[PDB]
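the six lines:
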Amino acid sequence: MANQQIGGSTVTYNGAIPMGGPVAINSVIEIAGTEVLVDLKLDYATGKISGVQTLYIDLRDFLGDVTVTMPDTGQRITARAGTQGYYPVLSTNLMKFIVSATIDGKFPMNFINFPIALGVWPSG
Amino acid sequence: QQAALRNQQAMAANLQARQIVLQQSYPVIQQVETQTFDPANRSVFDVTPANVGIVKGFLVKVTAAIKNNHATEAVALTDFGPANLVQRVIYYDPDNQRHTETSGWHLHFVNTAKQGAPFLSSMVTDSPIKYGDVMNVIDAPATIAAGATGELTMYYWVPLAYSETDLTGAVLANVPQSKQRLKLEFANNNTAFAAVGANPLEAIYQGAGAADCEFEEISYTVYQSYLDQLPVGQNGYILPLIDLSTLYNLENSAQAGLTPNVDFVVQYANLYRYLSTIAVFDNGGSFNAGTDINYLSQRTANFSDTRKLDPKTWAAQTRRRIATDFPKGVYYCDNRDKPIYTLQYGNVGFVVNPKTVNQNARLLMGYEYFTSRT
Amino acid sequence: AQVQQLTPAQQAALRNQQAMAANLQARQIVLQQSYPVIQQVETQTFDPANRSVFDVTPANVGIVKGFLVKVTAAIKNNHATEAVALTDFGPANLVQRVIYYDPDNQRHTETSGWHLHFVNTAKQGAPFLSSMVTDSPIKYGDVMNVIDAPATIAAGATGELTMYYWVPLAYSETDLTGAVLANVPQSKQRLKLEFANNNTAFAAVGANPLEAIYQGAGAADCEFEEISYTVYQSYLDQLPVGQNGYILPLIDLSTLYNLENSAQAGLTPNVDFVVQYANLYRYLSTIAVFDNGGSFNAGTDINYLSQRTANFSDTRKLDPKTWAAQTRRRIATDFPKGVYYCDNRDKPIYTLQYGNVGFVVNPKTVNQNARLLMGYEYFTSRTELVNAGTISTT
Amino acid sequence: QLTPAQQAALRNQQAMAANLQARQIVLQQSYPVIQQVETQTFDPANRSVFDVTPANVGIVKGFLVKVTAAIKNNHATEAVALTDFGPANLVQRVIYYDPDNQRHTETSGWHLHFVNTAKQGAPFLSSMVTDSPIKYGDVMNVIDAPATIAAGATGELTMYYWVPLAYSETDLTGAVLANVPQSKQRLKLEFANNNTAFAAVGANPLEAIYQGAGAADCEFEEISYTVYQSYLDQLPVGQNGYILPLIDLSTLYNLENSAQAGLTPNVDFVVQYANLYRYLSTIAVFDNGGSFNAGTDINYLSQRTANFSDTRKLDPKTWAAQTRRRIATDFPKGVYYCDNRDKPIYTLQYGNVGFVVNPKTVNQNARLLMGYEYFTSRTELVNAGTIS
Amino acid sequence: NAGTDINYLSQRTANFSDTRKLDPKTWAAQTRRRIATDFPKGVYYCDNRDKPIYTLQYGNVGFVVNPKTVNQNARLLMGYEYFTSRTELVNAG
Amino acid sequence: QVASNWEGPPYMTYNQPQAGSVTLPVAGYISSQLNNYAESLNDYLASQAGV
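prediction for all of em together
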């Protein structure tokens, strides 16, 4: 009882409305070769999308799970097997993403940049 | 234009105040944190610096105690070596603004590029007085045999100001509710030991016995260099105002989609004034000394090239800057005499025309640039 | 005047002060509003048994700063049992001569390849385009082999040389003295390049290895195969056109930055052998090679080296080790065996009479065909550069 | 106006502006001359202390001292080997005196070599080892010494010493005006003899040159020295006479060394910066009772101020990392350098400054050998308001 | 010690310019003109009776000892002899 | 002989940006300036014709 902690990690995020537009990015992922890295730092610097705020992950025909990881945060949003969904993410000005799965697959993925509340199409 | 005289009169008042701070204040370097950990538990740590004076950089000392637990086989050091001990460094301003978000091997190469020599290395001389490798400031064994234990050490300079005499990019950390921050990620047991046939890019050791290599400890120590005892006047502090308004940043990236004998252009961002460029042609877990690149260039917006050179002639330009060659696959482009602003002269890009492209081949791009609100 | 003949305040009075205030104002306008470009202009692969002298036409673009010459060579040995070994100058003897004529048909730089290599060494502060050995575990060092040559070509083996030459026109990247304007529809501007033959690049045991590349017992059968070369022009683009044409530094583009070389003879032991600096040049560096009859020694055949002046006799007069200690401050090593360097960059020799400043070698043992191979580096100016004409198409 | 503290600050600002103006007139109009003043070959078995009279010409900037030596090992079977300081111990002491009896430099042999290294950015007069196929390298053997003199062999040594009067070639601070009629200047030189340059196995090899099991039979054969004087001539003449930097020539650039003892394990050992100098560098040599270690016997080196506050306090490997940023190598085993050239230590700005070493291991007869490098001027000390 | 651990003794004005900088044998030669003998080992006398040392600013004249051999717990004992005026006269009666 | 719009020879200075000139504006920007747009065209054509 009452064990204090030593180290936490404070970090800034994207949570407001862009003065550009609502802009999403289709980045269909090919796995069964490795883990997949997505780097959108080039788009942030060259005048495009300001920061990923929501994910749309579409796993309808896939048999396993899909994990997306932010490296500045360590958040590990894991979409489930036969479900589609909107997921708000904690992501920084670094838009780097580590996409993984279990075995195989092709996944439509949308890096949304505007807030959409969470939902998952089948539940259970 | 009448507006180009006030922005040169504001530079004259700024440079008058820079030479007041650098001449009438005290350079301090003090230890802010030290910690020893096991990387199986955690490897990402946050360092709270001291909020005093004008901060102009951090010196990070990382040690390690890698042990090879294999039965009969050994591992050997990679080309990047102990520079992959810090996987990432992120710095945050007192106003929580991100300055530098590069990796470890790129931070070492800008440290090499800003010195004119490999960073904190001792050059071999003919002298009979015993100079040389005495203290082992940067040190790692070449091989670690089965059952052995190698001691590593490595130093990083995380810059805020551009140099010691040029206070551009420096941070004034005398603010009340300061959010100054220095993130650090370190190599755990999954990113530092690669098997044979793997990608030795972020690894430290590689060999037939990397499946049983592990860390015993990683210790880090952070030192903050800053300027204390700032000149105070009647109206307050005397400061180089548009020197502390400018950032000096270090970023890295990773591009893909390389095709043989096709130019691959990476565009420069229009808001930055780029000072250097580092391109690492990672040809699918294989690194080559220029024998897989036709040419490298810096092409402008129309189609005009400015330095379209063979990979041996590209290396000849870096040998009159850092007096040696970067490791194989690493290519450096210097623009310090005239920075790539790419807002006052078109849209400049960086071109690599490859000769051979393997599967999962990528191009890592490290940048170094100024940033303000002009 | 006590030491120098013209005492820099009263040699500034021999120049127009209103014309050099306008000249420095035009140089900083050019360096602010231009862009450094380096372009490949000419490439050719040849066999030197047929042709060895080449005129290279550089591009008529911007204000030219210099040329980067990459020379690659392949050498066959073709002996039965003997091998050859690299000489002291080595791969720097791949270019035997280099001549540049400007758009005004005025000769700028005329020297050999060994003397061009040493001025490239002396202006860097280190051996030219070399990689130092360090203790770092990160794999720096010799990765790309910019300047590279094998040390020994065995009996029936092939060696590959690579050598880079910087042919300077402008003095530095900031001082644009000696640069030429080439932004013209046509010009009388060329770059003459003499290369190593099969006669001059291989020397037998006993012969003078001065212009040679390899020397050994199996040097009679050594052949070249290909001496492919590449020329890179380095210039400043997008010149700041103001009123009445290009804004140009007129005194800077009319001054020549030259790199002549010579060969003096007539040395006798234990007396001074003076080589006179010429009249009305602004000397910046002197390089002396003591060719002692096909043999080159590490200082052990010189009593002292010196720089002499008519009044105020010796300005420096040092041992061969003390002369080499002044060189180790500048290039962080010393030059090859027999080469002696003298720096005059902060106080250039400009002496208004002929033999007023001289360079002295006092030898102590002199062979039969002994000579001094001088190499100079200087500013001179014979022309004036009034402003030019435009088109105005009807 | 009207207050002698700010009336003196106004004329010190005018005298400093006229000094920097007169300096760059001198460095533009003068000519650098280097000429030999003395050469002598001797035997250390007879005499080993020499005094050299430099010429009173121009503005003297410093002295280049070449020292050549020959050493025979007369042992039957045993060889000797170089120490870590090596041929820098050929000279034991360099003393220079003004024409007004003002002591400029009193280094040892090794301390003058390390300041020459730290003011170059590389080991002094060495040659870097490069990959070039053109035969650069070690051709002339400017500083040379054999690593081993076998039993019955002979070894030739060569060593160079820059004795600085002026600070640098662009800063004429510490230079001696000598074109006026005055007394003669004095350059004393104590050399190594057959008692100080050979140490037995176990003796303190601090000021030795060779050490080994055959050092009892080793001896010198000859020591030659040549002194060259580097000075400026054709000084510019204005309407009032010579144009001279008047507070650069009346400032002294000095190179003392010293020592202290009494070190306790895990206890901070302070060496105070005593006088009112402007200290530019500091060399600490931890002679741990004849043993020299690479930082494993020191907890931390530091520099304190008046309110006990460390302005740098680093690990011995971090102290050496700041050394590698300047001279691109490490100083020899046991030598610790401290650069203060951008902000010189001055014990009138922020109070009394000290130099701290916290040792981990201490052997018997352990001491801390210091070497200073500083500026000295005349302190003007006006009264401010009240006298009581 | 009888002068064998001191390089020189001096009296400099503005921490720069010495006025009597002598080695310990010439320093003892100036006191043999004063007391016709030598003070004991370690004792060094300096006579300023003809012109007394009188500054208006602190430390504008100093006494210098440049030693040669310094042991641990070495200290320098300084005895003074001086005149001091009072702020007023002494109220005779 | 001076001209208030002469920027130098017009075949050499027509595409040349001015001295400071970080980013150039457009010469006109009903929605924006109209008679300043027409006088920015007359001043350019007077530069190409020399009074």
